[PDB]
Design a binder for this molecule. Sequence first.
Ligand SMILES: C[C@H](CCC(=O)O)[C@H]1CC[C@H]2[C@@H]3CC[C@@H]4C[C@H](OP(=O)(O)O)CC[C@]4(C)[C@H]3C[C@H](O)[C@]12C
Length: 255
Amino acid sequence: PCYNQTLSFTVLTCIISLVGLTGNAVVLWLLGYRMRRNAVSIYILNLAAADFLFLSFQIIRLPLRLINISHLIRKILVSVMTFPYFTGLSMLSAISTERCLSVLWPIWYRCRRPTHLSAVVCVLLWGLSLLFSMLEWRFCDFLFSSWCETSDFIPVAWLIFLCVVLCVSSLVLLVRILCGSRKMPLTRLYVTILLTVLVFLLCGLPFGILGALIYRMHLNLEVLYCHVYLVCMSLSSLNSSANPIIYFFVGSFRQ
Ligand SMILES: C[C@H](CCC(=O)O)[C@H]1CC[C@H]2[C@@H]3CC[C@@H]4C[C@H](OP(=O)(O)O)CC[C@]4(C)[C@H]3C[C@H](O)[C@]12C
């Protein structure tokens, strides 16, 4: 904490996290058994599970900032929490590109899909989220040699690839929709895509870019960067909290 203005910030973070696990738990309970796992609901299911892990780790992390400062276990929690965050961003990107592919070629999607590619790509995303967690961890990495000592920007490359592929998938979906017959439910489609892109860039992505440029330039959080880290953490928490809403509750409450 800089001097003050931290207790209310972590209280807001904790409340947002509480509603986050509430929503993630209800959506996980509904989709786990009261669902059919058609083609994308698997993505929503495991994304909601990873998000539940996220907000749970948030409620584990924040209340220890005010009492019993330790400065080491904190690094451990942010290090481990990097993995569920990467998983959640990967699942958001996968959902976006998967919807884009479904719209681009619907016949292939509905007929010629292997009907198990969802699980395969899900486990590949989880495995690659196990990887790329060694951005800041330049600690005893060389256990043997050709390894980027300090300027290791491969996880940054993965994150920027995820962001750009999500953006290009949304753009291609919009171009395909706007270059065809206008059935004109073209207000629900506008709002959902705009909301997903906005909640990915304005929220969530700030946490990733914060980690990226905080381990690229080794900043000790000084007293100048103890006010923006809280904002980034709460933005990521709110993104993870509202993530189940947009993808499941909007559809469920539509009828
Ligand atoms: C998501 C990114 C990595 C993603 C990436 O770039 O590929 C994660 C990785 C390690 C995380 C930082 C480690 C400790 C940083 C310093 C402080 O640590 P505390 O004692 O807990 O207050 C605050 C947390 C802190 C600002 C974390 C911010 C950010 O979330 C990081 C860098």
